[PDB]
Design a protein around this ligand. Sequence first.
Ligand SMILES: CCCCCCCCCCCCC/C=C/[C@@H](O)[C@@H](N)CO
Ligand SMILES: *C(=O)CCCCCCCCCCCCC
Ligand SMILES: *C(=O)CCCCCCCCCCCCC
Lengths: 62, 62, 87, 288, 116, 268, 268, 132
Amino acid sequence: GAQVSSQKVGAHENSSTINYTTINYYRDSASNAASKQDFSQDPSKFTEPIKDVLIKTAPMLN
Amino acid sequence: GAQVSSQKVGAHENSSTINYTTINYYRDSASNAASKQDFSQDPSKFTEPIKDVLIKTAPMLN
Amino acid sequence: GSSSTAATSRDALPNTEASGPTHSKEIPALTAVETGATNPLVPSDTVQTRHVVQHRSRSESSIESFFARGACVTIMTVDNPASTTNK
Amino acid sequence: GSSSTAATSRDALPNTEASGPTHSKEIPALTAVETGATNPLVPSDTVQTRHVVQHRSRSESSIESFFARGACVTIMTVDNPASTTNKDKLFAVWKITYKDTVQLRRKLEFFTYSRFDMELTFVVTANFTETNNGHALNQVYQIMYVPPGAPVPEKWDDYTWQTSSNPSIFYTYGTAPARISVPYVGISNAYSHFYDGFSKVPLKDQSAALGDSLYGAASLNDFGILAVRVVNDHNPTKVTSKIRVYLKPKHIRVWCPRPPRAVAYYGPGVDYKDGTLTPLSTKDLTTY
Amino acid sequence: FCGSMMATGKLLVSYAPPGADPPKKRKEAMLGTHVIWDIGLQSSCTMVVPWISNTTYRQTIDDSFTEGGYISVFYQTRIVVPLSTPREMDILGFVSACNDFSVRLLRDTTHIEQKA
Amino acid sequence: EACGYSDRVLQLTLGNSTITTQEAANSVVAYGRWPEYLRDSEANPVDQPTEPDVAACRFYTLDTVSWTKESRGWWWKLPDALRDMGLFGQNMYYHYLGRSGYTVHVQCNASKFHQGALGVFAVPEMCLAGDSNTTTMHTSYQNANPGEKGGTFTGTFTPDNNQTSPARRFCPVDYLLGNGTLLGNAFVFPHQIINLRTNNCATLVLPYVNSLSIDSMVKHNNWGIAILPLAPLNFASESSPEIPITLTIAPMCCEFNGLRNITLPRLQ
Amino acid sequence: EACGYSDRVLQLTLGNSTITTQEAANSVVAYGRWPEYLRDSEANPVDQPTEPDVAACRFYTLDTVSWTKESRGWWWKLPDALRDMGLFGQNMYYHYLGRSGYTVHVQCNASKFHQGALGVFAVPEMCLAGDSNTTTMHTSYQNANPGEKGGTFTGTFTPDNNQTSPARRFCPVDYLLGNGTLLGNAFVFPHQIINLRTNNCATLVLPYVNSLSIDSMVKHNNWGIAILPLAPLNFASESSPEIPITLTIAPMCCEFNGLRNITLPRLQ
Amino acid sequence: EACGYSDRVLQLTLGNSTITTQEAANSVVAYGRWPEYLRDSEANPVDQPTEPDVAACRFYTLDTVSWTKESRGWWWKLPDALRDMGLFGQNMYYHYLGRSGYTVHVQCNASKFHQGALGVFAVPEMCLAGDS
Ligand SMILES: CCCCCCCCCCCCC/C=C/[C@@H](O)[C@@H](N)CO
Ligand SMILES: *C(=O)CCCCCCCCCCCCC
Ligand SMILES: *C(=O)CCCCCCCCCCCCC
């Protein structure tokens, strides 16, 4: 049941992808650690909540 | 996700390559131990920084 | 057995593209905040920019990353006196 | 599953080759240091050598190997007095750096720029100060990391110790010395062991005192500070504790080599002080 | 521009990267990164302050070494209005981050506290 | 070359300027790295950079200094030394950020009957020691940056004692490389030796070196040019001989960012 | 564009500077020729040219002048007007030869209740008439070149009578285009009209014009920018109204040859 | 539209009510989410729901307030503000539970010679501070 993943490597030694192994000991999801393998989304719903899609090169008001 | 490598063996017992097993527990590279699997390079950039490559058998100045 | 492993919180932000001069009918700089929206502008829209390969990430600013830290919510006080004490 | 495993740091150095007599127009021994270069010569170039199979390695002299050791960068002092005492409960505030001590600093300084993941190990020791006889229950220390900009603690017990966002280590006395890892956190592409300049530009048109700043000093606050305290409440019998911080540079890289510090360190900069400028000892030109 | 429709004008929005005398006159401000905003139907005008710095990252505190420079505003020509119209108006200003923007090294803020 | 070509005789050409030399000990390229423009993969400042090319990337000749039996050595800082040099200094002051490499050509001729050896060194981040024993890192911006005329080394450390009105300047002692380390080891740094009997000069091609891709040329000096007498000047029998040391330098593959109004520094 | 786009609303961007306009009468490109670098087939000076690009090829805003019922008109000369403008003036003075095009943006807004028409003209080799009737072609270099502040036109020709100590300057009469020809015909020259009721400004894109491929920017002015009131300023009922005329100009595809020491002109 | 259509001119129609506007700055849809009925996958109360449709899902015009140099601002709460509005308020009071979206149209005209800017905000769970 071992879950193997990739570490986004910062400062590399004078020493190919590096990995880290994770295994869940408990039956309850809540007991589990944070994956940190999270997703980004486009701000649109907040920065441009307007009915009629807007084109930056053209006049906002027309 | 286990990383198996070779130990450069020093003083051998009256007892074929010997190996050691390594596994990364953390998601962050920084948390990881030092591989010590490092590389050497030729001193040239410091011992012979001269524009015109030099041949030891011949006159340095010509 | 072993299980190995779209935009990720730790993916590099968008690269800055080389931009030259402009004499057109297109008006990015001009807008109308009244509509409730925020002008999606970028450096290359109002000035002459060079090509830049972006390595920076929003990894640490993600919802989990932002709160991924143990915080003190209270200090409880208890005790164990001498049998004799009146309290 | 299992992943198994050009010149390696631990590869055997070059073998010495058998060399005979010579009567030629080739002049290896002769050269010209003026060019800025160092004669790549080897025993077989100036003398008759035998064949030797070389087993020796430069493994231990590699950048990582050279620094692969925990070094003491500071000693923090904190305490926990009797509630009654008039003087304040003593909590420690240390500005993070490798210059408060000399050993590790001299090693890092063999080079201009550096890059590396930092491993901090904390050795905590406590003791009784007064010819008293009262005792004290096992102490629990709180090592809080306060980055530049964040509310620096003013009292052993003020709101800041909540550490909602800042990273804190809650160490328990008598237990295996505390340890944490830190990535390459520099605002630059590499740590600067030396900065030949200033944080400010003195502008004519503007008052002298304003444009002034320290020589060789960049960010007034490079990496913030380490704020340590004893979490336990004031105890009738006073107990003083000391926190020794061991710093080890891992996954390290270095650039542009320099000549080692030849004379006694005098402050955070390259400054030397009178009376310490004569390192070398007396020894005659013609005496073995 | 929250002034009346009958009110015209041309303003100069400037951005001057650190290292020199902070602009106190259009002349100096005009010499650096800027935008000549012309007031009309399009109520608002956006000036992009490009990521121009020596260090890969700047400090979230006042610091000579990681200084960002100067943002100043001026009258390109002058706010002109007809009769029966208000000679004085207010302009609101807004700030936001471009898609190339990021932050790091999470920390506790000073903008809130619990003295007691 | 059986055709004639040789290590001692070179011809360097940058923009409208050309340097010739019949007595050179070859030429040195710092850390084996030839000066280059800032790559897209390594770039930071997003704005279209200013590349003066031939207008600035040419040979500027600084004020000629005099070498004598008494001389303890001379020092300069880059870009500081070129700050007032034609279009290069102008572009450096008009911009917040700037990066540049250099071709350093140190000229010093004499005669087959003269003696002496000039140790010419190119030092990255050449931080120098101050004149004060009561305070530290106190050397003022004005004194730390001599400009074209550069500074000089002293055979002896003499502390600034005027606590009230401090000289606030450097006290670089020769045998300690002006920075707490033994001169004998300065050779680990990109360099060349001007040995009167062997050569007229020293040519060092320096790359842009630094913890950052591009930085503040006005606040920070990337390279330090140190010239010390390894072997003292000496001639025939004259008790007080003398020979000039002329220093000519040329900026390379240099580029600038963050354009605004000109920077007027308080240099005095 | 059904999408929104229009002749009246433009956005010009050069280097680190951007100009916006919601009330323009389109834009004019002198003789249908867009500014360009000197071609090999047409080149003269053999040395590698200096091309400042973004450092000089950007928008400089000159000193804002005031338009009133009394104003007879204003005049400027290129490159003269930009001679003291950042890196462009610096590169112009450091070089013997130089060539450059321009994007001239004349700004002048008012109100739906104001009246008036500004005749904005781009004149090649704009030679102006002197103040003397006893002598000719006598206008001094200092007076012929006002720099950024430019000069102005007069409704009347009044001869310099001080024979002993001559004013040695221009007497440009409005209706005669300051040069012996009728203003009504100035329109044969690249131009635009700023009619208060129709538009905020005038945008003229000027190419490098001249009998030579490249010339002396300091000795010779290629273009003349003349601004005269075709129809007098007028507002509601105010007897003495006023509105600013701001002039912003940007050098284009500009290049320089014959680099040497900086030219220090006797401008006073 | 080369045909005429524009951002400033809109026509909204709900049930027996229609709103027209020749001077609008487009329209905003909170969090990019258009009002919708409760889905089976997300439903809680098991009883057949009451959906008034056109009887309640139409335009109610509240009491007109006056804007002056002195005005510091105004506030309202939903559904509270519509509690007494025809069939919508009736159905709201007759039922234990209820859910609803809204199309908020704030009207305020003047003249090309007037000045001023009204900041109109839609705040989720707008908890306000007390007087004590
Ligand atoms: C709970 C413990 C958290 C520990 C937090 C440590 C983060 C700060 C580490 C800073 C590393 C500094 C290393 C030395 C850098 C110096 O050489 C600089 N002056 C050079 O750039
Ligand atoms: C999937 O996990 C199969 C591989 C198992 C690897 C050994 C597990 C190590 C110890 C786990 C026991 C779980 C603790 C409750
Ligand atoms: C790759 O690792 C698959 C083989 C797993 C071997 C068992 C791992 C032993 C315990 C690891 C758990 C990781 C701790 C966070």
